[PDB]
Design a protein around this ligand. Structure first.
Ligand SMILES: [Mg+2]
Ligand SMILES: [Mg+2]
Ligand SMILES: [Mg+2]
Ligand SMILES: [Mg+2]
Ligand SMILES: [Mg+2]
Ligand SMILES: [Mg+2]
Ligand SMILES: [Mg+2]
Ligand SMILES: [Mg+2]
Ligand SMILES: [Mg+2]
Ligand SMILES: [Mg+2]
Ligand SMILES: [Mg+2]
Ligand SMILES: [Mg+2]
Ligand SMILES: [Mg+2]
Ligand SMILES: [Mg+2]
Ligand SMILES: [Mg+2]
Ligand SMILES: [Mg+2]
Ligand SMILES: [Mg+2]
Ligand SMILES: [Mg+2]
Ligand SMILES: [Mg+2]
Ligand SMILES: [Mg+2]
Ligand SMILES: [Mg+2]
Ligand SMILES: [Mg+2]
Ligand SMILES: [Mg+2]
Ligand SMILES: [Mg+2]
Ligand SMILES: [Mg+2]
Ligand SMILES: [Mg+2]
Ligand SMILES: [Mg+2]
Ligand SMILES: [Mg+2]
Ligand SMILES: [Mg+2]
Ligand SMILES: [Mg+2]
Ligand SMILES: [Mg+2]
Ligand SMILES: [Mg+2]
Ligand SMILES: [Mg+2]
Ligand SMILES: [Zn+2]
Ligand SMILES: [Zn+2]
Lengths: 50, 66, 104, 154, 68, 91
RNA sequence: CUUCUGGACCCAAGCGCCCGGCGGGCGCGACCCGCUCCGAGGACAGUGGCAGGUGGG
RNA sequence: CGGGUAAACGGCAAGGUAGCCAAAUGCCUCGUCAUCUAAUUAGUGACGCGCAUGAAUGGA
RNA sequence: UGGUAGUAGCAAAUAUUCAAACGAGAACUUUGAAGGCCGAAGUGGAGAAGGGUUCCAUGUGAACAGCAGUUGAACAUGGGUCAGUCGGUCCUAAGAGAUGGGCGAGCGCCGUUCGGAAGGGCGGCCGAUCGAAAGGGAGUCGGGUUCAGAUCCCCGAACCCGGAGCGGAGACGGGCGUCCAGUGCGGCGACGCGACCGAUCCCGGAGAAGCCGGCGGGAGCCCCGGGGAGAGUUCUCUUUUCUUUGUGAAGGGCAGGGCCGCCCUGGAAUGGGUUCGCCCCGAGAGAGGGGCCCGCGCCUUGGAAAGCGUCGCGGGCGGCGUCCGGUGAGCUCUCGCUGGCCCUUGAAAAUCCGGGGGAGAGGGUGUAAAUCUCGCGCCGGGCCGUACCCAUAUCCGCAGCAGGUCUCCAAGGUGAACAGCCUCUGGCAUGUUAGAACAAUGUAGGUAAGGGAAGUCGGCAAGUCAGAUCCGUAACUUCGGGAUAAGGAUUGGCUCUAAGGGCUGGCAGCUGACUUAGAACUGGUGCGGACCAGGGGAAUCCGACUGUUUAAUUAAAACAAAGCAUCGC
RNA sequence: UAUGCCUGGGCAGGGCGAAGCCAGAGGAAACUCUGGUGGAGGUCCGUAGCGGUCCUGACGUGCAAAUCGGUCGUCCGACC
């Protein structure tokens, strides 16, 4: 909704910044095992609820 | 709307609402009251009729006389 | 017929969500939100059903920025009591105060 | 909620410059602008609040105090009243007849409003619709549609 | 906006300390002198064009004048 | 002028609630909506505002009377009884 | 010490006494004394603990 | 133990009164009669010792 | 991981086609054209709850979008939500919940006044606090600007609250230098004038009060006659058809509306005034003359400089136009008047104001106290929310799910109609695919000769009837009804006739716009021509009725119901 | 979702037409009759809305773990 509280909007800010893909220079490190960001969330498939 | 203004397209076979729906009876009575009461108020102010014949005709106008 | 919309997020026809149609200098019919119809003060007697005369019929907080002459009349009980019950109370106060002298 | 009207009687505070407004059970016959009087030396008129001991026998009163000073408990419904049967100056106890037919011996200091509670004859009108009975209890409480126990389950 | 009816009252408004500027609008039937004060836009409507130059030259010096 | 034969004011209920019940409310629906003469002003403007409340549209007098009539028979009998008890109490 | 009315009603008038350099204070007015605020109950209602009856709630 | 109480449960201690019915209630039963149709286990109106109707377990 | 099996299926809501462009690649994208749909209770334009970056730009075509895709609500990279006056914030609504007190083994619970409860300026309060983005609640609108924001930015014109410079008011002078006044003033009155002292205390008002009927005013929209400016048509006709033809808040003035709720004069029966209805009057009509409130209307400051239309020229310069009218049971909105209904009477509080009272304050002859934005000037207005979707693809239902989810604005024609049908503004591409064919069997729609329920548990399904007008309407009844009972006739088009108004001048002139009735003519007897749209009657059973009920197999004779009666206190 | 409470929102067009009122008639009188007006109601047809009768229709590994179509109930009230 347009009528947001500060805590909810701040909560949506953190979840929006975490939705980035993994930078490709991480995959070139020594003991790298991460192929891709497995915690990606889509707005239509997984709802936050909070 | 010019042909209907001359009476065309308004026969019996063109009516679908009740006569009271097309022209309300309460409206036709209200139009007649304001017409007849304005006539008596103009005749009383023009001294054509006195306040005693006016008040008598006012109650006869309120009845279905004229 | 240009259909117009609300200008605020309140989309319900509540008592505070009242509007009127206004023509802008740009030849546009827009919604202009109206203010509630204020009522003139009522008589303090509690008998006369009519409102007081000579006082603006505006909202309560609007009376804060109105001049005192626009909220009362030059009579004794003006702005609070109607002129009719003032004349009655002037007579009732005198006639009762005279009877309390006759009983003595 | 109640079928009897209530009167907004105004009094003067005997100790402060204050207008005391009370809410009585309107006796039948009173009107706005009437001067009603409360006390033991007030006259016997409809609407006045008198002790049940300072009144003649057979006096029709309403809003009778069950205990001395309870501000009126008995005969406060529309169209009801209590009759002062007899007195007893030795024990200072009056015997009153309640609207249910029972005769109760109360103290002679219990104040009461002389007259009958207004709104009488309300039950004499047959409620014709179920909707009229709905609105009757819609202001009282949630008890009107009474399912029979024989219509329920064990 | 407050409309001024007299020429004398217009000079008292243009001579104020909060008078920022005075605009001169030459219309078809009149000429308007709109002085911008702190709160209200005072306007004097002069009908005849003869009193336009009479009032234009009588404005206090230092007040910003603009022709529209 | 005579639109109905016997129902009159209770013709609004149609064929509902029974003949006896529509006849009992007829005596009450008439007395409830009837305008009475104001004993304080004289104008016939006493109308029932609520149950047991009767208001005059001219002198603005509010009188607490009966539920369906301006005054019940049990009230005028008590008023005359209290007056008779008051005079016998003073002497 | 208030019953004729849809009024008004307080923040002492007055007297006595006293202090300041025109003001202020006290008393009477507004009696004194006193142990429960005023009434209705009352060692009964009631409370806790045992005992009997009743109890498809 | 005794009294009252059935618009209390109920029954008809009392022996089903007024009513009603082969009924949404009749086992025998597709009862009998009339009517309704060329033909009716249906329908209706009647008849009622009614297997097992019936009066605020409300009758009509 | 198989057979099933390249099978079921990719079938609800009419529909696409042509050309071109980009591109390796086009039934699906984009532009243009044509043909259609939604048809203003929209497939339109904006919100609330919810979602949370889905919004916007560019790029990718790998996975996803059940065909494809050059496309996307996908993916990747950047960007985007600007407020004193919009809401939150403030108030208490039902409520919820501390303190005292009580209880409880105990976490705690009960409880919302009930205890030395006033932390203010002589004090009454009686109950801290929480609880509404639909209640209460001061005050911003117009134009312009973005790829996405807008009553928030920009420009212009204001307003409100809080806080400490001018002018004006108070201030009117008399009597003999002196003495003495002066906390305004007008009107018979309603009441007026730009202010016009005053506290504790007191009183009152506004906030702040249902639903329904009818009427009138104002506006927006629609409609009609013109005049401009563009455009369509121009085979024939058409001075034609279509589009567009305006002025915010705030201030002032004036129409208009309301005072059966006010004022003065006066006095009423031959009673009068008056409405659609009512209603009103010796507690004072009618009449005349006033006063007040509302004036969202018009004019005007704003203000045309801007906006718009059109013609040009080079973020702009210009020309020209933005006009004159007339109607209404029209449609919405809003303001009034007035009545009806209730065994229904249809909120509180914050906040703001008026009055009563006159404790006090102010200066001694020109001022002082004081001044309700009186009129101006100066300063400040913090915090949070603000993008977008708001639903046959942005919410919920496992999904782009034929379900579900609260509203606001509402064009023309037909018609009684916000019915159905057609069109304009706006929107869309037929609802998760296409091509070909037109077998059976289906689902949906329709017709059928002759007979007319012989079908079947059963007229199930289907059909008949249907609108309006003029007629005619029984048994029975609680007298209300039954009833649109039943049974009949008429219905088009065109051409006339008659009847129903208003304004102006004292009958005359001018001007309507909505209908009814009658008649003639006319036709392949067709005419509520589509659409919309009751089959009826005679009885029995049950329930009085309206209402309610097993969400997802039972809408009933069940429950409820008024009435009746009993029982307790 | 069941129910009470609080605060809001919403509910075309028509039919029959109740009390009150006006007038004209009839009558020796009591009183009656007619026309109009008025717009009552858990009124009627009916849109939105809310319901969900019948087809025991469609679907029935469905659009849907209850939906769709026609038909149908009610639609100022115990309404939504
Ligand atoms: Mg979802
Ligand atoms: Mg009528
Ligand atoms: Mg059961
Ligand atoms: Mg057991
Ligand atoms: Mg027998
Ligand atoms: Mg047969
Ligand atoms: Mg039989
Ligand atoms: Mg019996
Ligand atoms: Mg996008
Ligand atoms: Mg993109
Ligand atoms: Mg695909
Ligand atoms: Mg993404
Ligand atoms: Mg709060
Ligand atoms: Mg609000
Ligand atoms: Mg936007
Ligand atoms: Mg004073
Ligand atoms: Mg200020
Ligand atoms: Mg937005
Ligand atoms: Mg879809
Ligand atoms: Mg299709
Ligand atoms: Mg055939
Ligand atoms: Mg057969
Ligand atoms: Mg059928
Ligand atoms: Mg029949
Ligand atoms: Mg029988
Ligand atoms: Mg029933
Ligand atoms: Mg079911
Ligand atoms: Mg019927
Ligand atoms: Mg419907
Ligand atoms: Mg269905
Ligand atoms: Mg089926
Ligand atoms: Mg199948
Ligand atoms: Mg029906
Ligand atoms: Zn008054
Ligand atoms: Zn009176």
């Amino acid at each position: 909704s347009s009528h947001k509280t500060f805590k909810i909007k701040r909560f949506l800010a953190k979840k929006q910044k975490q939705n980035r893909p993994i930078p490709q220079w991480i995959r070139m490190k020594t003991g790298n095992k991460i192929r891709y960001n497995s915690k990606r969330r889509h707005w239509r498939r997984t709802k936050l609820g909070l | 709307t010019l042909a209907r203004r001359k009476g065309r397209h308004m026969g019996i076979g063109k009516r679908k609402g009740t006569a009271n729906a097309r022209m309300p009876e309460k409206l036709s009575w209200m139009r007649r009251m304001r017409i007849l009461r304005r006539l008596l108020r103009r005749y009383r102010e023009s001294k054509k009729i006195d306040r005693h014949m006016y008040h008598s005709l006012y109650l006869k106008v309120k009845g279905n006389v004229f | 017929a240009p259909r117009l919309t609300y200008r605020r997020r309140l989309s319900y026809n509540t008592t505070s969500n009242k509007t009127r149609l206004s023509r802008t200098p740009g030849n546009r019919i827009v919604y202009l939100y109206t203010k509630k119809v204020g009522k003139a003060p009522k008589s303090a007697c509690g008998i006369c059903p009519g409102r007081l005369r000579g006082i603006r019929a505006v909202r309560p907080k609007v009376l804060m920025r109105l001049s005192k002459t626009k909220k009362h009349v030059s009579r004794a009980y003006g702005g609070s009591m109607c002129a009719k019950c003032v004349r009655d109370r002037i007579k009732r106060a005198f006639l009762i105060e005279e009877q309390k002298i006759v009983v003595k | 909620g109640r079928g009897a009207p209530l009167a907004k009687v105004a009094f003067r505070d005997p100790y402060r410059f204050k207008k005391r407004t009370e809410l009585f059970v309107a006796a039948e016959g009173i009107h706005t602008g009437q001067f009603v009087y409360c006390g033991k030396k007030a006259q016997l008129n409809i609407g006045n609040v008198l002790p049940v001991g300072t009144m003649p026998e057979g006096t029709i009163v309403c809003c009778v105090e069950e205990k001395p000073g309870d501000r009126g408990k008995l005969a406060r419904a529309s169209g009801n009243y209590a009759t002062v049967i007899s007195h007893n100056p030795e024990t200072k106890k009056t015997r009153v007849k309640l609207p249910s037919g029972s005769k109760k011996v109360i103290s002679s200091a219990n104040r009461a409003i002389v007259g009958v509670v207004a709104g009488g004859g309300r039950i004499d009108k047959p409620i014709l619709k179920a909707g009229r009975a709905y609105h009757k209890y819609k202001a009282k409480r949630n008890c009107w549609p009474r399912v029979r126990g024989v219509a329920m389950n064990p | 906006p407050r409309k001024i009816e007299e020429i004398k009252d217009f000079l008292l408004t243009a001579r104020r300390k909060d008078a920022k500027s005075v605009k001169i609008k030459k219309n078809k039937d009149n000429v308007k002198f709109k002085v911008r004060c702190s709160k209200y836009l005072y306007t004097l409507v002069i009908t005849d064009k003869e009193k336009a130059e009479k009032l234009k030259q009588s404005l206090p010096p230092g007040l910003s004048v603009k022709e529209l | 002028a005579k639109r109905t034969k016997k129902v009159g004011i209770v013709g609004k209920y149609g064929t509902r609630y029974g003949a006896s019940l529509r006849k009992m409310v007829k005596k009450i629906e008439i007395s409830q909506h009837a305008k009475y003469t104001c004993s304080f002003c004289g104008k016939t403007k006493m109308k029932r505002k609520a149950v047991g409340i009767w208001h005059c549209g001219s002198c603005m007098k509010i009188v607490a009377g009966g539920a369906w009539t301006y005054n019940t028979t049990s009230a005028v009998t008590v008023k005359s009884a209290i007056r008779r008890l008051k005079e016998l109490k003073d002497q």
